Amino acid sequence: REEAVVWDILDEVIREHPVLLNRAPTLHRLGIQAFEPVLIEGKAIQLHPLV
Amino acid sequence: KPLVGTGMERAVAVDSGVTAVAKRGGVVQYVDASRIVIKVNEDEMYPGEAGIDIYNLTKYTRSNQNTCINQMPCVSLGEPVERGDVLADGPSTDLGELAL
Amino acid sequence: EIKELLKLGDLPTSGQIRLYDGRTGEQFERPVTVGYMYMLKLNHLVDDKM
Amino acid sequence: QDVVLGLYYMTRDCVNAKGEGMVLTGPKEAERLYRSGLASLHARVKVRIT
Amino acid sequence: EFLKPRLVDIEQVSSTHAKVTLEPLERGFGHTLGNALRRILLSSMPGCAVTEVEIDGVLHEYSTKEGVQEDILEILLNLKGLAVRVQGKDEVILTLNKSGIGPVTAADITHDGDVEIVKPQHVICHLTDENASISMRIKVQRGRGYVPASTRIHSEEDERPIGRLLVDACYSPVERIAYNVEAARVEQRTDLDKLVIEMETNGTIDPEEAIRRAATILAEQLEAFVDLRDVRQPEVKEEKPEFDPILLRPVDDLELTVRSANCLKAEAIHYIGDLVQRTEVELLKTPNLGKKSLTEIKDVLASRGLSLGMRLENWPPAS
Amino acid sequence: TEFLKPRLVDIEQVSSTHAKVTLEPLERGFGHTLGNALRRILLSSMPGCAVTEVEIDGVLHEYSTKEGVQEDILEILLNLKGLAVRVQGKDEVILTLNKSGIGPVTAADITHDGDVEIVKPQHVICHLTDENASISMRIKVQRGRGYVPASTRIHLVDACYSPVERIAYNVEAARVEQRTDLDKLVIEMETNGTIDPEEAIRRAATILAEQLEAFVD
Amino acid sequence: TPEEKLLRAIFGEKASDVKDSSLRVPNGVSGTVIDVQVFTRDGVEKDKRA
């Protein structure tokens, strides 16, 4: 139902829970890296520029 | 329409089927978002069956890549058009030019 | 011919003007180029990839 | 790339511009001088640093 | 130990465009109020613009009226920019009617005491066959900023009118804003400054009206800025629902017959927490209920798992 | 029509002079407009009292040397800018620095006047070397709105009137349950000690309200 | 199963002999219906809408 109550729950489960980001040809171990997720309005992934 | 163009855009729009190009030169009898009727000039008009050229327009419809392909009339009621004139724009064509 | 058509348009030959940051309202150092570029949206639209 | 072009233009100097030659108590008031358009970003200056 | 500005000559030059000037400005406040006003002028200004539209014989944006040379998708995209101004009302449904081979302008609408069509030449569509004829119920609301069509279905709850084609809402009458502070010396003062705020309206806000309601917001925002009370919220809401939530849904959800649908409006029963507690006794004495009329209600309460007429010594709690 | 005014605002202050305030949820664009407009008033047009002119005892010019002090003349001018002055009923006061002997001349070593309040008597003005080393000068504090350099006087110390040592505003996204992009405005400010950051903003904002006394209803 | 059986008996649902296979709109994509076609076997009766 996407009840608005759930959004506040999701932010709890998201906090200290890393996710893994991996881009096309995995060449060195830095091809997969773990980030802490920040919720975004939009359908694209936001990737820190230094990485 | 491209502000910065090359000149080819009219050739690509017309030669690609997407646009509706006048068969015979004449004057417009009726203009609908649906169809366009051309009352043929005498010179180009065949002797028998007389009559008018009637162009039925393609309206909102699915493409191979799920984009929409829709024709629109680019002339107004009772305007002179000659044979080989642009009668209706396809999608991503403006006024006879190719506007991607 | 471009610069000449800029004259007729009463626009600088540089192709550049000064701009102001809409947030702080202050000037942008250096002239920046502004102009019109025909641009396409290609059909790698996000809400198909996601 | 974008980010380094940033710092370069910042920590760079030109021969003569706003703020030429003055002296400031510390970094804190060096920004104060710039943000208000009194000093140029790149002008030769003695400042107290620690 | 400070000064304060005010607005001297406001100089129109078109219905759409005018340079309003603000004379008593101190050193630098020019660019300070100047930028911080453009920000609140380009966004937060009130505006009315057409929200929904129903047209005679058309079912969706993507069709073709007979004898018109636009497509519904184009006529809608023409209305988005129809520039109206209304006064006491908040949502007003205008009506359009015209026949015959002829450009239907904005003037061809019908007038209401509050409707001012600030541009009556504005093309809406063209007819093209002698006895072709269109009619539409255009509905205009008034809000703030940009409410695009899509977000305008989550409130649903029966917006069913298939005819109503929703158009993207451009609720704002600012087109483009531009200040420039030229220096202006009142005869004696070291150096004060001017502020020419050149602006470009759609025609339906008179510059002074605007620039005032602009400064108003800045106040209410800065209102909380003055002191800073570290403020927070109570929070910790309630985690104890007694009854089953089903008793908090309206009686529509029961999917019942029309003669029985209005009848619970009558005898004062919206939520089913009241239909739940009204026995069969209560029901012959209610307007228009009988042998065929009440068998219907004992059957849609069975499927959902409730019964007619019981108690709950606590209805309904509690805020 | 009606607007959005913020809720939840936490001032977390580090030291009494410095403080960091977070304040959500602002309407779209309202973080930058309030942020930038308040930065300008905090920095540029903020009433304060700093040192403006210095006539020296021993030498007429700012490229000379005083016997007994290793800090150059241009050095002490900077120390003067870093003295925080606040006058009470008096609009202008001028102090005398009377101190001599082996050791640093602090700010508690200045004359204490009735309408004078030195916010840091610890502030180091200049050091004194061995033997005797004589120093007494007249240093004129002035009252003004802003930061006025020594260079702008045509007919001398840069005058740093305003209490603000540094201001920056950071605008970040804040969500309100079912609102997508709102602003969270973080103001960080450092002061010269003559007024605490919390109150500094109050009057800072009051100033901007006073200028709108012509349009609001 | 038992607990499903007991549940059907408490709330009285006539556990149907037919599965739900209906064509539904894919999650996230949203638009306007503009056309419906029905193709029927030669010799099966065209239903109402068809």
Helix H, strand E, coil C: the string for F184-217 is EEEEEEEECCCCCHHHHHHHHHHHHHHCCCCCCC
Contact at 8 Å (CB) between F105 and F137?
Answer: no
Burial of residue E299 (CB within 10 Å: 0-12, 13-18, 19+) is: exposed
- F181 — phi, psi (to 5°)? -135, 105
Which of E26, E35, E141, E225 to mutate: most F Cβ within 10 Å? E225
Return the SS3 of E54. strand
Contacts of E134 in chain B (CB under 8 A): none
Nearest to F29 by CA among E3, B59, E44: E44
Q: Give the residue ranges of DSSP H helices in A1-51.
A: 4-14
Angle between helices E29-42 and E207-226 (to 10 degrees): 110
Kindly give, in sequence order, each residue whose CB lies less than 8 Å from that of residue E138, ignoring residues fewer than 6 positions away: E50, E53, E79, E82, E93, E94, E95, E96, E109
Return the biggest CA–CA distance within chain E: 94
> Which residue among C38, C40, C43 sits closest to B4, beta carbon to beta carbon?
C38
Both tokens of residue E217?
């917001």
Contact E140, E94 (CB under 8 A): yes
User: Chain B residue with minimal CA distance to E129?
Assistant: B30
Match 């949502």 to its residue by tokens.
E91
Torsion sign, CA atoms F56, F60, F61, F64? negative
Q: In chain D, positions 29-48, which contact chain F (CB-CB < 8 Å)?
A: 29, 31-33, 35-36, 38, 46, 48
- CA E201 from centroid of its chain's CA atoms: 20
Sign of CA dihedral F51, F57, F62, F66: negative
Identify the CA nearest to F3 among candidates E37, C23, E44: E44
Evaluate whether chains F and A are touching (3 or more beta carbon pairs less than 8 Å apart).
Answer: yes
Give chain F's end-to-end CA distance (angstroms, integer): 14
By the 8 A CB rule, do F183 and F30 touch?
Answer: yes
Mutate to test the interface with D, among F147, F153, F156, F162 (most CBs of D within 10 A): F147
Choose from E31, E37, E150 for mutation: most chain C CBs within 10 A. E31
Q: Cβ separation of G34 and E60 shorter than 8 Å?
A: yes
Q: Is F110 exposed, middle or buried (0-12, 13-18, 19+ CB in 10 A)?
A: buried
Nearest to F3 among E215, E220, E225 (CB): E220
Residues of F in contact with C25 (CB under 8 A): 36
Gap between the Cα atoms of F96 and F109, Å rounded: 10
- Torsion angle of the four alpha carbons D13, D17, D18, D23, in this order, in degrees rounded to the nearest 10: 50
**Long-range Cβ contact pairs of E2-7 (< 8 A, separation 24 or more):** E2/E26, E2/F207, E2/F210, E2/F211, E3/E192, E3/F211, E4/F210, E4/F211, E4/F213, E4/F214, E5/E29, E5/E33, E5/E195, E5/F211, E5/F214, E6/F214, E7/E208, E7/E211, E7/F214, E7/F215
Residue E50, H or E segment:
strand E46-55
Interface of F with C (CB under 8 A): 32-33, 36
Question: What would the two tokens of residue F162 be?
Answer: 């305003």
Rounded to whole angstroms, what are the CA distances from C42 to B6, B65, C45?
21, 12, 7
Resolution of the experimental structure, in angstroms: 3.8
Residue carrying the six token digits 């759930």: A6
The sign of the torsion formed by the CA atoms of F144, F150, F156, F162 equals positive
The verdict on whether omega for the bond into residue B91 sits within 30 degrees of 0, i.e. cis, is no
In this structure, the dihedral spanned by the alpha carbons of residues E153, E157, E159 and E161, taken in order and rounded to 10 degrees, is 150
| E221–F34 C-beta distance less than 8 A | yes
- Which chain E residue lies closest to G7 (C-alpha atoms)? E305
Q: In sequence order, what are the residues at sequence separation of 6 or more whose Cβ sits closer than 8 angstroms to the Cβ of residue B26? A: B38, B39, B40, B41, B44, B45, B52, B53, B81
Tell me what percent of chain A is helix, strand and coil, each rounded to the nearest 5: 25, 15, 55
* Residues of chain A found within 8 Å of residue C47, distances taken between Cβ atoms: 43
The DSSP letter of residue E247 is G
Angstroms from C25 CA to nearest CA on chain E? 5
Asked whether the beta carbons of residue F216 and residue E217 sit closer than 8 angstroms, the reply is no
Report the C-alpha gap between F5 and E213 in whole angstroms. Answer: 16
Q: Which residues does chain C have within 8 Å of residue A42's beta carbon, measured at their own beta carbons?
A: 46
User: CB distance E31–C26 less than 8 Å?
Assistant: yes
Q: How far apart are CA F131 and CA F135, in angstroms?
A: 13
Residue F109's alpha-carbon distances to C21, F56, F58, F138, in angstroms, are 48, 17, 19, 14
Contacts of F38 in chain C (CB under 8 A): none
Residue from B85, B86, B95, B81 nearest B28 by CA: B81
> Which one of B29, B30, B59, B60 would you mutate to disrupt binding with E, by most E Cβ within 10 Å of its Cβ?
B60
Helix axes D27-35, F30-43, angle to 10 degrees: 110
For chains B and E, count residue pairs whose Cβ atoms are closer than 8 Å.
Answer: 33
Nearest CA in chain E to B57: E64
Q: State the nearest Cα–Cα gap between E26 and chain C, in angstroms.
A: 17
What residues contact F201, with CB distance under 8 A and at least 6 apart?
E225, E228, F21, F38, F42, F187, F189
Query: Residue C35 and residue C29: Cα distance in Å, rounded?
Result: 18
Residue with tokens 């505006």: E47
Set out the domains of chain F in order of their start, with CATH numbers: 1-47+162-217 (3.30.1360.10), 48-161 (2.170.120.12)
Contact exists between A and C (3 or more beta carbon pairs < 8 Å): yes
H helical segments located in E129-257: 207-226
For residue E292, give every residue at least 6 positions away whose Cβ sits within 8 Å of its Cβ, in sequence order, or none: none
Element (H, E) at B69: strand B68-69
Give the SS3 label for residue A10: helix
Nearest chain F residue (CA) to E90: F1
Q: What is the CA radius of gyration of chain F?
A: 22
* Vertex E232 angle, CA E230 and E237, to 5°: 170
CA angle F110, F114, F120 (to 5 degrees): 45
Name which of B32, B60, B70 is nearest E69 (Cβ-Cβ). Answer: B32
b/e F2-27 (16+ beta carbons within 10 angstroms → b): eebebeebebeeeeebebbbbbbbbb
B67 and C CB contact within 8 Å: yes
E90 HSE (CA, 13 A, CB side): 3
Contact at CB, E223 and F5, closer than 8 angstroms:
yes
Per DSSP bridges, beta strands E92-99 and E133-147 are antiparallel
Q: Is D23 in contact with F164 (Cβ distance < 8 A)?
A: no
Nearest CA in chain B to E125: B33
Task: Tell me which chain E residues have a C-beta less than 8 angstroms from the C-beta of G10.
Answer: 305
Q: How far is CA A29 from CA A17, A18, A36, E133, F164, in A?
A: 20, 17, 18, 70, 48
CA distance A18 to A28: 20
Look-up: residue for tokens 């005018």? Answer: E18
B with D: touching (≥3 Cβ pairs within 8 Å):
no
How far apart are the C-alpha atoms of E112 and B91, rounded to whole Å? 40
Q: Which residue has the tokens 């609408």?
A: E109
- CA E151 to chain G, closest CA, distance in angstroms equals 12
Interface size, chain D vs chain F, as Cβ–Cβ contacts under 8 Å:
41
Q: Which run of H or of E encompasses B51?
A: none
Distances (CA, A) of F69 to D24, F100, F102, F136: 20, 11, 10, 12
Cα torsion E83, E89, E91, E97 to 10°: value is -60
Contacts of B59 in chain E (CB under 8 A): 64, 71
Q: What are the residues whose beta carbons fall under 8 Å from the beta carbon of A50, sequence distance 6 or more?
A: none
> Which residue, among A20, A24, F7, has the nearest Cα to E235 in the 3D structure?
F7
Residues within 8 A of E (CB atoms), C 1-40 only: 20, 22-26
Contact criterion met (CB < 8 Å) for G34 and E303: no
Nearest to E2 among F6, F38, F207 (CB): F207
- Token pair for B15: 């030669």
DSSP code of C26?
P
Q: Which residues pair with F141 in a beta bridge?
A: F51
Helices (H) and strands (E) in chain B, counts: 1, 11
* Residue labelled with tokens 């009848």: E263
Q: What is the CA radius of gyration of chain C?
A: 17
What DSSP assignment string belongs to chain F? --------EEEE-STTTEEEEEEEEEPTTHHHHHHHHHHHHHHTS-EEEEEEEEE-SS-SSSS---TT--S-HHHHHHHHHTS-EEESS-S--EEE----SSS-B-STTS---TTEEES-TT---B---SS------EEEEEEEESEE-STT------EE-SSEEEEEEEEEEE--SS-S-EEEEEEEEEE-SSS-HHHHHHHHHHHHHHTTTTT--
Regarding chains F and B, contact by 3 or more CB pairs under 8 A is answered as: no
By C-alpha distance, the chain D residue nearest F73 is D23
Q: Does C43 touch chain B (CB under 8 A)?
A: yes
- C-alpha closest to that of F123 among F134, F146, F107, F137: F107
Burial grade of C39 (CB within 10 A; 0-12, 13-18, 19 or more): exposed
In this structure, what DSSP letter does residue E25 have?
A: B
Tell me if F43 and D36 make a contact (CB, 8 A cut-off). Answer: yes
CA atoms within 13 A of residue A50's CA, in its CB half-sphere: 2
Chain A, nearest residue to C48 by Cα: A43
C-alpha E256/C-alpha F191 separation (Å) is 71
Tokens 């570029």 locate to C37
Cβ F177–A39 below 8 Å, yes or no? no
Question: Please, what's the b/e burial string for F54-86 (b: 16 or more CB within 10 A of its CB; e: otherwise)?
Answer: bebeeeeeeeeebebbebbbeebbbbbbbbbbb
Report chain E residues touching chain B, CB-CB < 8 A. 62-71, 73-74, 101, 128-129
The pairing of strands D46-47 and D23-24 is parallel
Strand-pair category, B52-56 with C16-17? unpaired
Residues whose CB is less than 8 angstroms from the CB of residue E152 and which lie 6 or more positions away in sequence, other chains included? E51, E166, E169
